[PDB]
């Protein structure tokens, strides 16, 4: 008991992990795309304005 | 002297019951302290995986 539950609450802590750092660096990622986005429109709308 | 023959014979075989099943009780003790020895050892090898 002690033996499966324990490889299998590595494995699950293993995509927990995996998980929590995809989370974080999503946040991340998706904030300086955003500001790309933003800048990147912004002149884009200026010029073509 | 014959009967004395049979009985000394099944008395050594009783002996040998009483041995072989204690010996295998002992084998049983073995088997559960290397079992709970192996189950801490199992808490060691789960946390390391």
């Given at each position: 008991?002690v033996?499966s539950?324990?490889?299998?609450?590595?494995?699950?802590?293993?995509?927990?992990?995996?998980?929590?750092?995809e989370?974080?660096?999503?946040?991340?990622?998706?904030?300086?795309?955003?500001?790309?986005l933003?800048?990147?429109?912004?002149?884009?709308?200026?010029?073509?304005? | 002297?014959?009967?004395?023959?049979?009985?000394?014979?099944?008395?050594?075989?009783?002996?040998?019951?009483?041995?072989?099943?204690?010996?295998?009780?002992?084998?049983?003790?073995?088997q559960?302290?290397?079992?709970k020895?192996?189950?801490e050892?199992?808490?060691?090898?789960?946390?390391?995986?």
């Amino acid at each position: 008991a002690v033996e499966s539950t324990g490889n299998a609450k590595a494995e699950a802590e293993s995509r927990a992990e995996a998980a929590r750092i995809e989370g974080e660096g999503s946040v991340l990622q998706a904030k300086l795309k955003a500001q790309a986005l933003a800048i990147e429109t912004e002149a884009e709308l200026e010029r073509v304005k | 002297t014959n009967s004395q023959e049979a009985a000394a014979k099944h008395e050594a075989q009783r002996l040998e019951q009483e041995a072989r099943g204690r010996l295998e009780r002992q084998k049983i003790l073995d088997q559960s302290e290397a079992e709970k020895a192996r189950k801490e050892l199992l808490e060691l090898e789960a946390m390391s995986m």
